[model samples]
Target chain A: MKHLISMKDIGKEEILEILDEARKMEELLNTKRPLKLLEGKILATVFYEPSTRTRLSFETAMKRLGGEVITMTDLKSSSVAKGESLIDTIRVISGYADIIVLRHPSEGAARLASEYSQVPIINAGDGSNQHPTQTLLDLYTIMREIGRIDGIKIAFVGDLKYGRTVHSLVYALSLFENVEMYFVSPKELRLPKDIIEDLKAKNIKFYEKESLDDLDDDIDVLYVTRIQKERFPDPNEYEKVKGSYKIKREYVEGKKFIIMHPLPRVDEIDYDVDDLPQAKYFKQSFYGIPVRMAILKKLIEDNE
Target chain B: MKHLISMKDIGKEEILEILDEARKMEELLNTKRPLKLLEGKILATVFYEPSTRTRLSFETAMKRLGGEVITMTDLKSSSVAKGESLIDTIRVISGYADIIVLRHPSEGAARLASEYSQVPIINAGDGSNQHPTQTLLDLYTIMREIGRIDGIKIAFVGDLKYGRTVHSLVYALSLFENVEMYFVSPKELRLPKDIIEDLKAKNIKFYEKESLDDLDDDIDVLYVTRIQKERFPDPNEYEKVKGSYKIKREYVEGKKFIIMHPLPRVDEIDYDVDDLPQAKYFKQSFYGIPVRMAILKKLIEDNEGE
Candidate 1:
């Protein structure tokens, strides 16, 4: 629990343990009394790139546990602008706080920071490499909804080529027993070849398709991701495929699958489908606090 | 006690009371033991404009008192970018923290935020309007260095025209008794005429000087400030006045005046002056944390009628 950098690093047993801790944290948050577990401790969120949602969730998690937080939301105006190196910044900030949550633009930046850091480094995100906390919360959401992670059918919808969360969660689910997955996206926006090859090597039961029209009604989850225009080289290419996989109310009218999204979505999930029992994106976002609380508590408190 | 927006809002007695509290904080810091007076309390630093020094000082102060800090260092990526109003931001943040320290580029931003805020607002700096905590620390530095704020001759140096710390300190000093002052700056960067007129109406004894050459040995404090190059439109005009007021070590070899700068100083005082006994600018910067601690404690705790 030294650092929660990638989903690939955490085993199935540890993931279940973290979820167990998160459930307790959720109960504590609901009780409305202050949880002062990390009193006198400090958590620093050094975000080189802005992610208001991630920063706010981590801040709330720390505060809920009676821990302090010192944030550097933008590095452009900070000492980073003064030609300070990442390792130098990490070394200096490590002395100031007990744990550091870093969100940088460079892939593997968090891992590099952890190498030189004295405290644990939770990668809020580091480019397209990984977002372990997102994967954890995604798994936590799945567990909460279906009451199990094993033997559940989950369909990852939309842009899989650049969907960091989709890839991370897929790798995580590969560790579970009897879990099946669906990769539903346009032809041009399909999951990367190497990832499909990895899933094939693992002998995991999964399906890849250009549309959700053929998706099984028994699918337990629909993990939706935004089809970013920037991911496509040509705007015309994006336009042709955009809105091709909308999760409409009619689509989930009688389906048992719960829909989830890592949000700031741009018209991916239909507004009409929001009130249905299948829409779990908002609650999934809410679960970010407790799961992050569990991760922070585990890293700082030595839960061996 | 609700908000510390400007030096004008505080009287001479309350100023002295804060200095006294700051003195206690300084001693507590010297002990190097954890001080948990404000445990369970949170302080939010909302900076619409970046001032690394100011924000860090307030954060250190809160942490030193065993309190927490939640910061919004940039407004661009915040909800403000999505068209949230200043009052809305303050009201929402007020629910999250016990006190708010604001630094904004717009004048009167802190005052406007104070109106809607549920918690106390400490104006770290709001454009050129006021930086009350800086004034308090300046006062605290003076009291600690010269042993008294009253009956002391102090000289203000450099860009007094745009130095918010200078104006606030001047107004604060005007409340003291028998405090003589000297405004030393180029003609273009002199103290604003309105402030000079106000000082005249108060019958305060002060002089305006273009240079520090004519200063007497009786001057107890030499408060130097940076003459910002951006303040002048003509680059050549700035070049002429760039090295106009260098406080060389040789120049202060026998002088009694202790030099202070509200820092991140760029060449106003010579590097040699740093080794001089008169150098108090570094110490002045250190005093910011303790003085801010006193202000945060006073505003957050139930110190009514004290």
Candidate 2:
């Protein structure tokens, strides 16, 4: 719970504590006056990579808690851009702020930062590696929507192979009781063999499917992800699957499910579906504040 | 006034309006139930260069106004690292935001963006060219400190020949009345000949002094700029001017002056001078919020003015 670098660091009881805190925070934040629980604290945002959602959410969460944020948004503008090393930059900035939220393009970037940073460092995203905070919020959204996490049939759609959200979500959901998973992706983008083997070892009942055709009525959640063009080097290869798995109201016509996406969406879910009651991704986006508040409250207090 | 790309486009009345609004916004910001002036609005920040102070201040101003900020902090992480043109990046983000504030490491970047952007673009800074917002806030700081723009004595210290702030500040201060300007720097880094000619054309009274020796006792404001090492081809040449211009209590002993630095000061003023009564650069940094509030309100209102 100290530094949410991965879900492996979290157990079942800890997740429930965060969810419960998120619930209390949701009710509190809904009221007119926002709380200032982390007043006098500072959050240092050091992003060696570009991120609109993760950066914005962490900032919003800190501000919502009456905390100030000092950031080095463009690495090129900092000393690092002029030949300063990542370790040096992290060490310098970490001394100035209470906690650090970092997003670096290199894998194991957060782990490297955590070792050097004097304060706790939350990993926003590290290349295609881990985005555990995103996973926590995604899991929080599912818990909010389904009223429980165990024994639910959830369909994961979009780029299952490269989507970090899907990768983390699949593993995190398996930790719950009797969860049945349906991964919907193109033939070229199936769940990785390592994760599939891990699921098999955990005895989690799940299947790989291309469409929502074989999905049961008992499916509690439909987690969708964007087919990021940034992932595909060849423009032609990206063009083939550009609109392959786009979800609109027409796609979800007769379905009774909570639909979600890790947002700043790139055409995966049609804007038309955004107005639907089933659309909970935007809600999921806002929940980042409360979940992070819970996390900040837990970690900062526990450390103290 | 739709966006603050350049101060050259702004007139005296508009400038005053922004300054006045900034003052009011600072007062409002001191309380709770933060204003919802831009509640549903979105600002996309794209910094092609690095600036922690300017970026955070702008973001804070927007959030205080109850608006959301979407940022692109790392150009190297995006398509830009793959040699994508700045225009193409602007074209995409222009759709995602209502307004864009850009900080690029090239001259005329803001001007170029304003031409291509669907949303109004605020120029945060361009390479070694214009940082209109910084200039605006600097002017705003001087205006607040003196209580009036006319009839003030201000000294421009350190690197003036190559300093972007000195360029913008000189042009801006030229618009005022009966102001005495001091261009204080080493003989090698003295204010350029073209700037001197321009000041003469404006009929502004100015002094080109080698040092702050006699100027400190009479000046109302002392504006300090960093001596850029990158401009100096030789490390040895930069070392000569290193500690020579470091301002201290002795420098400001008898002066009724407020000192300011467009900061991240390397060696301009001795670090000990930070606690002086007249030291207002840190306070000036906070003043950016108000200045931004002023400009944001004015720009957004002018575009939507009934």
Candidate 3:
């Protein structure tokens, strides 16, 4: 795809191809520092909404490939007046940068920007919609750490409904073979209604539950998310869900599953679990660079 | 020589040297491509307050030199929390970048940062105290166009009392010999009280005025500024000064002097005069890149050699 607007658009081969290329890209990062592969190229990161972590991760990837980066962060103090449309900004920036990585607050904003842009556009995230790079990194982490994506049993816990990361990853895992899912969340915050229908139609095996108390050895990967307080209508229900979803060290002690989290994490995963080899969330966070590097190279080169 | 925090810290020799290098640096910009002189080097532009034009110019300089740049423009949404001290931010960023270009809202913040930074700190602007790079670019523009700094009759117009650009340039021109000055503004917005005292002490030739009405042909540079509406206590006072000080095309028609403003021009120089051969404010804006590149090269290289 020319624009990485969603995981819904990416094919199975394209996903695997990216993962393989990312393996090589990670090797490139570890070897003789700052490879001059992308010299004289510019990446413009226009964050109309703030995601410091994702923006920084994209910048690190481009710079590591020897590309230059320019940014438009703080709209309040911008040279361009606030009333100007995103389309106008994209048209202007398309001249300066070889690639534009946009993270606007509105859903479908990146899709609209890509239509106007002269250069390739990478959507870092847009509202509650797609954040495909994060999913790609999630896939890369699982494939790299567990040795394969096909046939790995993964359990997704916490706010499975509102969390974009969980939804994107589930759709991605549908592309693989023999993948079984055990989605653990509060009953009100279960995976969306049609998601299970699509999973069944796609012939993907999955189970749903409101508790992780009975989580067993059949799971290979345990994907965790914050049970966000803002999502629930009642504070008491949110509190109970949060305490139940909290992954403690005593419970994690004998689990054979590898744990993953999209980080800048709060206390959902116990701090003591950070010492264990099973807690691979920090590793998952780092894989964002190489995965982004692979996608950037692919899109820029393909567009060229 | 390392940290360019203030015009106060810069000597006459360093100012002249930076201008001379900036001339060469501008030529480098016009050549075949982005020069690879600063490869592997990274510049961190950490702005606690926003100044888009200045930050863009600085980033352009580094990128043109084939150097990398990382920025911190918005603190409100930054992962690095808002409560963090400027010194602590400097301490963390100094490890990441080869040099740090700082623009803080508090006066002397860059000076304090320079004392603690592991890498060289360039003060882009700190509160209202100093923006020495701007002074260097102004000097470079004057010298590049006029072919000399000494003996030039330069006019300082508009908000003479509050403009840091006029004040900084005035102080820098003191380093040169035979420089004449024309201080033009309303009586309420005249040059600062102690500034003229220092001019006399240094034996710098200058004249103060509320008008440019009798502006003579001898002046080689007409440096204009906006008589800012925010600076005056009374709105009526600001309006009168602004209108009275406005530089019109008719006034600029036959003048030998070139015009300058540290820009984002707000009608102080009439839009009609923008078509005139004498207006160099935009050219002055472009000079920001080369002058900054020169300073970055000097500071980063010197820090390395030590």
Candidate 4:
């Protein structure tokens, strides 16, 4: 658990272990005093891009457990604005913190850092490649809602071609038993074919659907994704696809589905869905703290 | 309360209130439950220079009260790199946060921000000019530790001519009752005459000493300032002034005085003095949280009471 660059490197048992530890941490927060789980440790959050939510969760989790945090919230505004490479920049920050949490715009950037980092590197995210820690929190939300992850069906809707969050989650869920997934999006925005082939090779039963018009009534999870304009090379194309999928109260009118969204949502889901019981976006954020707390505690404190 | 642009804007009563509120905050920190004094508020820390300490304290203070923080820790590197002006930058950031805590390298930058900021602006520091918040923190620290600020003989040691922290503190201390000031530095780096004239106009009796000769025995509080090599315009003149007023073990060996420093000290005070009973620099930093907590509470709560 030293690094979570991708779910491609982690198996089902380990993912469950991380989620279980997250559940333990959520329960721990109910106690009177916050646990000093990482007294002598420090966490540095280095983001080349702006992500206040990701940074806050990691920082709040570390601080609650008696760990210190140092951050480079935006690198284009730090010394790196002087044309320093990631290797050179991380080398200096590595001296300051015990663990480094990074989110870079380049794919495989975290793996490149593993060669130079003195402490463990947790990839908060890297381009369109992966976001494993986010998947862990997503899984935590599922367990918290459905009470279990076994025999559940999920719909990873919208931006499937470029949604790193569900891409990583789907890859991780492939390791699980009896999980059914639906890739629902416009034809132009379908999940990458290589990923579909990989899931097929693993004997994972997943269906690709064009729309949410005929969704199953018993879907345990409806994992929706935003159309990432920042990821799009053409703003026109992104704008065209953004309105392709919409989540409304009508979509989950009578269905027993727990809706989850990796947040900072634009018009992808109706704002009206925020108050619905099916909406678990904020819960997804709340689970971020415990999930991160578990990861920091495991990385810094617990030897086992 | 929207912005602390200058000490000239603060009156005697407001200064006392800030210190009083800081002391109360210190007492509250001993208790357990989380206080959401500023829940929906967001404080933006925009630094144009490197201030690891001031930035952290302001940020931590905002969060200690359950507020959110949006920071641009290094500005020359980020939005500024995007070809944004200070005005444009303030406009964009002001939309995001309830207040802006600005630290810039230009002298009149904070005042310029005060003009345009839609929300409150806390001037963390602006070049070598005014840093009123640091002044507030110093005054707060003194009253918290010494029990009162009235009738105290304070000695400001080392480079008084260039230390903005010392300059701001002098103006703040002048507002208090019965305080005698001593300026101890090299002949080259003596207190600026304009500031000395203001102190005289205020009818505050003060002495100018060439070195730390009587520093230990006479002063109630000894404030040591760094002899920043970077601030010196002439290197040879700086070489003469660098080693003249070191606050050594011998200086504080028998003295019963509280030692204070605005930090990131390179060599002005010897490292050996750090272990002394009077050494309060680190404690001074921790006190920053309460001091800032008081300021934030006062500003957003009372609408900049002064």
Candidate 5:
């Protein structure tokens, strides 16, 4: 009966439990048999901002588990455009579907919806806020690629200031022992002050770097994020700094680290990098299904 | 399995068969038990055009049958915007769901999808070309409200020139015997020439009226359509002809006919008309569920036997 609004609300054991549940789905999908775990159950996807990748992954996950989905992908034609509040819409939709997956343009919208909704609310992505399910899939991807999550060296590159996934992953990784994280970004796009303070207070091993040079040779994961042009105050500054963070195949050709991205990747990673052995973004995207399958099953099964 | 591409694809017998199947669903919905005819089956609704009402009804119909639905309500965000052809999209989606309900803005898009799709393709509404499901629900509504589709007098009022549903319903009603139709609208917005010629070729008794006055007293149904202001070429012309077709309760108070609208009504029918016994548009919308359920079941079950 938990509402996954952020990684902060989850404990290490619960996170491991979800990962274990996801592993079960991995086995089920491999069998090529229809899994009717949530028959007659419903999942409603209400997205104000469009993310075809995230929405479809969650949808595919629900359907693989034999559940129905009711989608309101656009809010322009929905009741929201007619001056209805989020709380009112949630109340009305809560009656139609068993559980709701919401993606809105406002920060804390999922949290606000959780307060009003009778069913559990899975935050798909609300503004630049916490996308907990993305964090789960990211964790699942790391676990699947590397044998373990503990004692792994992961470098988070590009926009750290506005990278919602990076922030959530950092918070989740903080819970584990002997993990080191590299925050690699320009000074203007560095990790937020409070997050850096939290890492310091927790005695977590982390470092801030301006460029991709001199990384630890034992680094297991290289996570890249999009540095949006809109994040820069000056358009000239965006033009100057945009190409500096782009990862090419040659950059990581001889490296032993796995490259991962929370995708819909826009120029941050070259197409040539897709063929490299270290490139695991597609596999990362594919793991979204099982991870989400785990989350949906856990929330609904607990209701019984 | 049949693809309801157009009213021309159906006949008197098949239309009645669908209505009968719909009636069975209506009876089932009245009871308290769960209806799970297509329990594990999947219904994919790919709406290239936005029609919340139509999409919701189909989704509700599938869910009520204990079937699952995967929705692509917006194609702009989909692969279609990335230059994927209709056939290609249908091919990919056909592998994902059991039955595909397509609503596109291009003429014959649904038929094109039917050619490439491995699953049953139900045309929700493909541009201004055809919307057979709306015609089915319309026929279902007429049969439920008036108790018969044959030998009934139905008056179609409003934008006949661009009214897709109106033309489809007209052609469907042409299959029955002694069914008189009144094509009531401005002379400029009268029924299309080929359709008018089709009625003449069939020797169907019909009339072309300029207004609502002097309608036959035995009219059993009055189907109203929206006269879109955007349909006219000139704004001044629209302004001159607008509000000429508004159906008020006062005008139909003494009439014996029931009023039906393929809705999202834009001031053509007054709010006062909603409370009248003849106001069957809302009930018409509700009937979409059962009729669609029958369609999904028939299509999927036929696939099983195939």
Candidate 6:
């Protein structure tokens, strides 16, 4: 894969191959000395907007494989202040690294960067759009736990209307067989109509609801997201809807399904549910490293 | 060296030993395969303010030795804006890496970090205070060029009182034997009273001059520095002083003494002089990598053997 930009661009075979490589990488990380797979190679993480968690995860991935990394994170303050265009910045940084991981604020920025770049462009995220690696790692975590993506049920709770990570992952699961999804959010914050329409056309079984009070007990994955007050135009509606989605430990007490969040959680996944075995949110971060290691190796080595 | 916080903490012997080891590193850089001396080692460069040149140079040095680097240069926006104290930040990062290069805006911040850091702290700079690495690299540059620092007559032309790089290097050279010095700047921007007093107490041979019109031909090194506009309390004084210090190519056409600047040059050294053999400022940056490699090795290795 030259560029891992959009989940729409990735099919079932490519995603499974990436997850396979990620499993091997996780094994290497656990049982072996770090291999110098990327010796003398460099990766640059160019973030036009700050996502500390995303950028650090990618940096850790490259370093774990013995790749050197140079960053342009601070340039958002200096170079952007100097009015340097992303096109011009990409042109210069392409000369410095073998692969570039870009997180920008503009929509479709990853595609634009790939057009102008000499090296592969792995989109960390582009505005409220795709972050393919997040889905890949999310898939890897699911595969490692329940042992399959097919025939499993997942309920996406909170901010499905505005959460790009949820929409991206839900779209990826559409490629698999026998997967069921639940969109658990308030009426004002339902999954966008376009995704609903597409899923309907594909005859994918997905349920949409306003509350999780009686969420199906048969879920294999409970993916959660934060509901930002800023995402709600009116603060009163945000206040009313936010409290209803907080996943209580009692609600999650004996559930066998694992819980996950693209983190920096704020009352979304209940603090009470933290120590329970279903709380896989924290452990989920560990998979991002190996999954990224797999993607970096795949992107750079396949091109070579 | 547990922490390289200040030039004052370094003596003649330690400075010489660092320079000696730097020579070997430069040899490794030039003549052999890039060594994996620091394999599995990680260096964290945490900057509260940006210094693009200093940060990249140090990072390149660490990477050339096959060490991994993780940077926190963007924390100036989030963490500092969120009012997170440097002490707390250092305590956390010290656990993440074997060594850290801290550049901050507070004076004496480095020493305070060393107090709390689980790992060694390499002060890239602390406010307008000491940056011992700059002085070490400058010394390495001088020693590489002139073959020796003793008995050398050097002229420091430009913002002497305001330039911490110049002050630190001049202080380090004071530990060397029989070095002569000249101060060339507008009298308003002359070397400060405290440095002059210390040199006088040591009976060090030095001269103060207002202009370069009659600069002595016997000098072995002519170190140049940028006279920043912000340093002057009065803008008019800055305007009058800056032009007089700009070194022209015609003036420096055939001088045997090498000219060096801690760079980001802004008309202080003539661009026309760029292609000349005496312009060691650009090539001088290459020495910084190996010199830093040597310092990283010494600080980390010496402590491990403890």
For each candidate in turn, the interface RMSD (Å) is 5.3, 6.7, 5.2, 8.6, 5.0, 5.0
Which digits, one per residue and each the tens of the lDDT, describe model 6 over residues A106-193? Answer: 8868999999999999998886689999999999889988899988999999988888899999899989998999999988789999
Per-residue C-alpha lDDT of model 3 across residues B226-255, encoded as one tens digit per residue = 776677769887777778889998889988
Q: Give candidate 6 regions above 4 Å deviation.
A: A1-34, A37-52, A67-304, B68-74, B78-98, B112-119, B213-215, B231-239, B249-256, B272-279, B303-306
Say which candidate scores most in lDDT: 1
Please give, for residues B179-257, the per-residue lDDT of candidate 5 as tens digits.
9999999888899999999899888999989878859678999999988877777988776666678898788787889
Candidate 4: tens digits of C-alpha lDDT, residues A1-304:
5666777788778888898999889988877485877754557788888788889989999988876676766665534333445764565455445688988887768988865676678888785677878888888898889888877998888888878787888887777788998998878779999999999998888888887875778688999888766656798877666665778777766678888888878777898888888888888889999998998888764422
RMSD of 1: 8.7
Residue A22 Cα positional deviation in candidate 1, in Å, after optimal superposition: 9.2
| Candidate number with greatest TM-score | 1
* Candidate 2 Cα deviation (angstroms), residue A297: 7.6
Question: Backbone collision count in every prediction?
Answer: 0, 1, 0, 4, 0, 0
Error at A25, model 3, angstroms? 9.8
> Which of candidates 3 and 4 reaches a greater DockQ?
3
Candidate 1 residue pairs in clash (backbone atoms < 3 Å): none
* Model 1 C-alpha lDDT per residue in residues A1-304, reported as the tens digit of each score: 7998888899999999999999999988766455798878889989877766578778978987988788876785655557787789899999999999998888769999999999999998796688999999999999999899999999988989878888999999999998898999988778899999989898999888888888879999999988876777797877766757878898888999999987755568776786798888777877887898899999998733
On residues B20-129, what C-alpha lDDT tens digit does candidate 6 reach at each position?
A: 99999999898768688887777888888888888899899998887878777756776433334676567556644578999888786899999878788999987587
- Model 5, runs deviating above 4 Å: A1-49, A66-304, B77-85, B231-240
Tens-digit lDDT track of model 2 for B1-306: 666777788777777777788888877766644477876877888987655556777876776676778888657555544688789888889888878889887776788888788777888877557778888889888988877877899998888889888889888888888889998898888888998898999899999888678575678889998887876678888777765677877776556999988776657876566667888776676677778866666666667623
Candidate 5 or 4, higher TM-score: 5
Q: Which window of 10 residues has the lowest lDDT sum in candidate 4 chain B?
A: B27-36
TM-score of chain A of each: 0.96, 0.93, 0.96, 0.91, 0.95, 0.96
Model 6 lDDT at residue B261 = 89
B77 Cα displacement, candidate 1 (Å): 6.3
Q: What is the lDDT of residue A161 in candidate 3?
A: 78
Ten residues in sequence with the least summed lDDT for candidate 6 chain A:
A72-81
